[model samples]
Every structure is written in C-alpha cells, then in structure tokens.
Target chain A: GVIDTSAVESAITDGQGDMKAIGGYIVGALVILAVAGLIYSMLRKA
Target chain B: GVIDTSAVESAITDGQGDMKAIGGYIVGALVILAVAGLIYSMLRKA
Candidate 1:
C-alpha cells in the first residue's frame, strides 16, 4: 500500500498554477476589452 | 502519533471551495466592468 503524500502535494501545486494561469488570461482579456472600449469612445467623439 | 487523513481530505475540499468562490468573484467583476464599458460607449455616442 503506497499512500504517497508527495503526489498529493504536487497535484495541489499544479492545480494552483493552473488557476493562476487562467486568472491571468481572464484579466488580460478584461484589460483588452476596456482599452478597446476607450478607443471606440474616442473615435465616436472625433 | 495522530495521523488524521480525514482532516487532510476536508482541507482539500475547503481549498477547492475557496478557489471556486474567488473565481466567481473575479468573473463577476469582469462582467460588471464590461457592462459599464458598454454603457459609457453608448453615452459617448449620445
């Protein structure tokens, strides 16, 4: 019977990394959308 | 020596729940910002 605690730790670490990566992508998209919206507004004003 | 595997299981479950909660919060904020950006764009056009 091999109950590897190390594997559990590794899995948790990987999960955290994946979550961070996804979060970054989401934030990046949000920023891009915000910038695009600003540009659209400026174009309308001009 | 008290090795409580149950406690570890509970902790993992709680961690998963916390991640879900934070993810939801981030997504909600992104949605609100997107909606606000749309409204601002509309106001500029009008």
Candidate 2:
C-alpha cells in the first residue's frame, strides 16, 4: 500500500490559498464598510 | 498501485475546517469593529 503524499499536500496547500483569498475578501468588505460609515458620519455632521 | 484515498480526503477535510475557523474569527473581529464604530459615532454626536 502506498500513499500519494504529494496529492494530499497539494490539496492542503490549495485549501490554505482558498482560506487566504476568503480572508482578503472579508477584510476588503470590512474596509468598505468602515469607509462608508465615515462618509455617513461626515454627511450627518454637515 | 493502491493509494490511501482516505488519508488524502481526511487531510482535505481538516483543511476545510481550518479555513472555516479562520473565516469565523475574521468575521467576529469585523463585527466587533463595526459595533465599536457605531458606538463612537453615537458618542461623537452626543
């Protein structure tokens, strides 16, 4: 019996990349939300 | 050749769990940030 360690490693690596991409997207959305809040505050003050 | 598909699948599943955990943590942080921003805005207005 043999195990394809490389395939498993590749799968794990790909999963990590997906996680990073998702994290980036979430952070981007958070930044957008923060900026929107700031603009809303400025408008309210004005 | 026989390959241990179970091991490979297990690794992939574990990776997915890790990704989900990381995503949850990031989202939790984002929620905290959003709440803090809201509180700051209210304080500034008052």
Candidate 3:
C-alpha cells in the first residue's frame, strides 16, 4: 500500500520551530571580553 | 607577600553570571536562521 509521506514530513517540521527557538547568543560578547582582558593586562605592564 | 585570591575569585564569579545571561538570546536567533536556510533550499526545488 502507498502511504502519504508529506504528512510525516510536516509533523517533523512542527518540532523544528522550537529548535529555532533554542540556539545562538553572546558568542561575540565572550570574545570581546576576553580581548579586553588581554588589553588590560598589556596596559598594566606599561 | 601572598596574593589575594578572594578578590580574583570574586571577579571571576561575577563574570560567570553575565556570560550565562548573554548566551541565551542569540542562541535562539542562530537556530531560527539555520532552519530558515533549510526551508530556503526547499523553495528553490519547487
């Protein structure tokens, strides 16, 4: 028997929205602070 | 003279909370962008 696959495809799509809700923040902020600490250390040396 | 580790420890502890708060927002934004890309591929196919 042939089954309708699009329905299953749409069901999987339902959960992905929440995934879109779950990732990516402050990545650049960490790098900025780390660099700021390095610069502070160098300035303290002079 | 010995160094004051309590002060250093306090600074590190303060930074940890800020890192946690900044991480949550952009994490979701990237996930949404990624899934949106996947949908873009399907659009090209049709």
What is the C-alpha RMSD, rounded to one decimal, of candidate 1?
9.6
The C-alpha TM-scores of every prediction are: 0.43, 0.45, 0.40
Ranking by lDDT: 1, 2, 3
What is residue A32's positional error in candidate 1, in angstroms? 1.5
Query: Lowest summed lDDT over 10 consecutive residues: which window, candidate 3 chain B?
Result: B37-46
Q: Show model 2 residue runs off by greater than 4 Å.
A: A1-46
Tell me the tens digit of each residue's lDDT in model 3 across A1-46: 0123333344347546533433223345567788998999999999
- Separate clash counts for every candidate: 0, 0, 6
Looking only at chain B, model 1 earns a TM-score of: 0.68
The regions of model 1 sitting more than 4 angstroms off are A1-3, B1-46
- Best prediction by DockQ: 1
Superposed on all Cα atoms, the candidates' RMSDs to the truth, in angstroms, are 9.6, 11.2, 29.5
Ranking by DockQ: 1, 2, 3
Q: Which ten residues in a row have the lowest lDDT in candidate 2 chain A?
A: A37-46
Docking class of 3: incorrect
Evaluate model 1: give its lDDT.
0.61
lDDT of 2 at B25: 53
Each model's lDDT comes to 0.61, 0.59, 0.55
